[PDB]
């Protein structure tokens, strides 16, 4: 139903032979851009920023926490529909009632707050990763994900997206420097 229109950016180079740690700028560009354009984050990435186009490491976690406040990137408010999902994420269970609450949670947040940015522990790396929830489809039960590791937006199943959310909200995987993990959104978006 709810599908937002944003430009996709890969953190790989054009040939796909170079992998940059640009997940932070890519995801920030997704939630801040509009109507298939690109947000102007060039003042932050070009000005002698060692965390941009870096093949070894990305942006510092505490430095990224302050960057989100400057760009009006807010954490989603702790609502009751969010709390029920978060308690289900602590149990790592995805039954029908949880899946229905997940469907209504993602639908509500995408409608009222626009595309969401997920900061979570990486799946195949020691660091953190950032990806974006940009659409949802209740017919096929899939979520539209803007993951800069891929070459294009991807429709992923709900339980796969649910397992990604588990990394950011379950206490098993949260380290001492995972205080930035969670779901964010553009503070200037309005439906």
């Amino acid at each position: 139903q709810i599908i937002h229109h944003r430009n996709f950016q890969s953190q790989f180079d054009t040939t796909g032979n170079t992998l940059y740690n640009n997940a932070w700028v890519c995801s920030l560009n997704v939630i801040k851009s509009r109507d298939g354009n690109n947000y102007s984050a060039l003042e932050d990435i070009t000005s002698d920023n060692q965390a941009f186009n870096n093949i070894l490491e990305g942006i510092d976690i505490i430095e990224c926490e302050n960057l989100l406040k400057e760009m009006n990137v807010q954490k989603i408010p702790e609502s009751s529909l969010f709390t029920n999902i978060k308690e289900a994420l602590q149990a790592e269970v995805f039954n029908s009632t949880v899946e229905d609450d997940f469907e209504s949670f993602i639908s509500y947040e995408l409608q009222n707050h626009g595309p969401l940015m997920l900061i979570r522990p990486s799946l195949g790396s020691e660091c953190l990763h950032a990806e974006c929830i940009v659409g949802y489809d209740s017919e096929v039960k899939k979520v539209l994900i803007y993951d800069s590791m891929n070459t294009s937006p991807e429709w992923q199943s709900n339980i796969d997206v649910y397992d990604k959310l588990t990394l950011a909200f379950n206490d098993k995987y949260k380290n001492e420097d995972c205080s930035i993990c969670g779901l964010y959104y553009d503070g200037v978006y309005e439906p």
């Binding site: 953190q11 790989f12 796909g16 032979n17 992998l19 940059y20 740690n21 640009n22 997940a23 932070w24 965390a51 870096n54 093949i55 070894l56 490491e57 990305g58 942006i59 510092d60 976690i61 990224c64 900061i119 522990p121 990486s122 799946l123 195949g124 790396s125 020691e126 660091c127 953190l128 990763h129 950032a130 990806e131 993951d147 590791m149 339980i159 796969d160 397992d163 990604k164 990394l167 098993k172 995987y173 380290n175 420097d177 930035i180």
Partner: protein, 160 residues
């Protein structure tokens, strides 16, 4: 000409999985790899031969190493695997079978056969058939056999 292979790096905590990836991909070694916001997995591009280019995805099991259970979003589409243990610790070698069994329950080749899995005897600076296609005495600190083990895995992946 271009191939994309996803390979899992699994094992117990403190055996050298992150160090092996950092040594092979970034030619780097240290005892504390700080965390940033950048990537979901590692990438290594290989000029395998004159007519083949191999892009090797290295997925560090990372936060799932203390619990030993594999999620689909992690292991999906995997075609190879490194199983790493520490030779200086006896308990870390014991859990190699527990990782190999959990690996054999989740991922498999398209024909149903098990995926090529290489056993890494890390910290080698300081056989039994359970399904492993090979074994290597590797050292992330001294850069020993890490590059050979990668080509040995890519070769077994290209056989299929």
């Amino acid at each position: 000409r271009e191939h994309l292979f996803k390979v899992l790096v699994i094992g117990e905590l403190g055996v050298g999985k992150t160090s092996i990836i950092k040594r092979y991909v970034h030619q780097l070694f240290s005892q504390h790899y700080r965390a940033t916001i950048g990537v979901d997995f590692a990438l290594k591009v290989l000029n395998w031969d004159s007519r083949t280019l191999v892009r090797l995805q290295l997925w560090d099991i990372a936060g799932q190493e203390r619990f030993g259970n594999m999620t689909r979003v992690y292991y999906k589409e995997a075609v190879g695997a490194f199983v790493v243990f520490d030779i200086s610790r006896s308990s870390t070698f014991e859990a190699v079978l527990k990782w190999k069994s959990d690996l054999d329950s989740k991922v498999h080749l398209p024909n149903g056969s098990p995926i090529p899995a290489v056993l890494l005897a890390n910290k080698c600076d300081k056989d039994k058939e359970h399904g492993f296609a090979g074994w290597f005495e590797t050292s992330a600190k001294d850069n020993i056999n890490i590059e050979e083990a990668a080509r040995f895995l890519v070769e077994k992946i290209l056989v299929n």
